Structure 1
Amino acid sequence: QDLSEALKEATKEVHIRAENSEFMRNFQKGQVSREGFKLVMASLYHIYTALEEEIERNKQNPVYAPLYFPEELHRRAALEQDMAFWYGPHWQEAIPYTPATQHYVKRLHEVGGTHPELLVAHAYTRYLGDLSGGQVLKKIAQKAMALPSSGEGLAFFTFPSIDNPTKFKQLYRARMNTLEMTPEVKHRVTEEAKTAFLLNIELFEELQALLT
């Protein structure tokens, strides 16, 4: 069984749970506000910054190298533009760094620095979602908050270096399936992917509480 398929099957359950968190449920209904949107995007800024810092650290490591697509996938630059859009010229000192976000970042660094063979679980969880359902969330946000089709404020959800997300996704999956795999690695990667989903749900639960 290919890793790409093992991951999808192993996280399809927790994915349903994540979609139904209070925050994401409200979001889907289009009840997402500027204050709430800012909290999640600021948090993603920190998360992707940590994720990509670890990706760079392990770019030449075989347990991750085949998935090294900075130009097409990396989000930090886009999130920096979004931060300037939502928080202003001095966003760096204005954006929040919540406990749940810190917790996520902590695990990302543990994985990247100590268990790099599991980094793929975290890139899969975030990037493949962005390339698929993330496009749906993008439309919802635009409609809800009157964001321009030109893209301002939603750079995170825009991949200008990729013609077709569905095509790249298939490529990314194929490359994921070239990683040297053993029962040991496959089992732990799928487990870490479930943990990654949980970290996201915990972030969403925290943000909703901060909002209510």
Structure 2
Amino acid sequence: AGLAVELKQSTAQAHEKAEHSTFMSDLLKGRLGVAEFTRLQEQAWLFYTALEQAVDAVRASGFAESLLDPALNRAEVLARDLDKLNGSSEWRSRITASPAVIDYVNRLEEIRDNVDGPALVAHHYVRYLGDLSGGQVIARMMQRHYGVDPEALGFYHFEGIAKLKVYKDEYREKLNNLELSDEQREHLLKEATDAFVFNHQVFADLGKGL
């Protein structure tokens, strides 16, 4: 099978475990509220910011340039979401990374400084293709359960993408057409597993004290 299929197969168990996260299932089923949704997006702003510096570096190196579409950038869209959710830009100087996000960001800075192309693509697949594939569902649940205004949900919609099912097919075809050595390929597949572990840990830190 091509890269896109084995990525899906090798992370399918982690995706199902993520859906059963105590924090995330509580958020999605309506048992939390807007404040907790805002906490999650603050942590996301931190690791999307680090992710996009690593993407900038790997793109500048020439690796997987076509896959690393800048239209996918989420950090400034999240910042505008958060100015609306919090009522001011005051959160920017205030939020601190949870331990999970500290480690996640550390790894993304390691990938940026090593210009580790294969590892970055793994993180790119896990965040952005997950966003593209399920973001509309999550945003709808925040509307339905908590009345979150759509203009605070821009993170879940990609403005510069017209046909969504077509874009996702092309993304997977670019994954399939990536040229990789056997070792690079094992490095990428392992990193995809790690990227799900990191995201699961972020959920665990957010669930603390609840």
Same fold (TM over 0.5): yes
Tell whether the 8 Å contact from 2:118 to 2:185 is kept in structure 1 after alignment.
no
Structure 1 partner of 2:127: 126
Matched AA of 1:198: V
Aligned pairs for 1:96-115 within 5 A: 96-114=96-114, 115=116
CA shift, 1:43, in A, is 0.6
| Aligned position for 1:184 | 183
Amino acid at match of 1:111: I
> C-alpha root-mean-square deviation of aligned residues, in Å?
1.4
Q: 1:192: how far off? A: 0.5
**Is 2:63–2:117's contact at 8 Å kept on the other side of the alignment?**
yes
Distance 2:164 2:120 in 1: 21
Structure 1, unmatched stretches of 5+, are none
**1:141: which partner in 2?**
142
Checking the alignment, whether the CA contact within 8 Å between 2:119 and 2:191 is kept in structure 1 is yes
Which position in structure 1 is the counterpart of 2:208? 209
Mapped pair 1:82 → 2:65: no
Q: Secondary structure at the match of 1:152?
A: helix
Q: Which whole-Å deviations, capped at 9, do the CAs of 1:34-68 have from their partners, x for residues lacking one?
A: 22111110011011111111111111334332212
- In the TM superposition, residue 101 of structure 1 has moved relative to its aligned partner by 1.1
Cross-structure match for 1:168: 167
Structure 2 residue ranges without an equivalent (≥5): none
The alignment-based identity, stated in percent, is 33
Q: Are 2:110 and 1:116 aligned?
A: no
Distance 1:12 1:63 in 2: 26
How big is the shift at 1:106? 0.7
Q: Are the counterparts in 2 of residues 19 and 25 from structure 1 also a CA contact under 8 Å?
A: yes
- Count of residue pairs brought into register by the alignment: 208
Q: Distance in 1 between matches of 2:180 and 2:11?
A: 19
Amino acid at match of 1:141: M
| Cα pair 2:118 2:187 within 8 Å, conserved | no
Q: Say if 1:18 and 1:201, in contact at 8 Å, map to a contact too.
A: yes
CA distance in 1, matches of 2:146, 2:95: 20
Q: TM-score, with normalisation over the residues of structure 1?
A: 0.92
8 Å contact from structure 1 (residues 7, 193) kept in 2:
yes
Query: What is the TM-score with the length of structure 2 in the denominator?
Result: 0.93
Deviation, structure 1 residue 105: 0.7
Partners in 1 of 2:84 and 2:165 — Cα distance?
28
CA distance in 1, matches of 2:191, 2:132: 20
* Amino acid paired to 2:28: Q
Q: Which amino acid aligns with 2:10?
A: A
Q: Report if aligned partners of 1:131, 1:166 keep a CA contact under 8 Å in 2.
A: no
Letter in 2 for 1:94: R
**In structure 2, what is the Cα distance between the partners aligned to 1:95 and 1:206?**
14
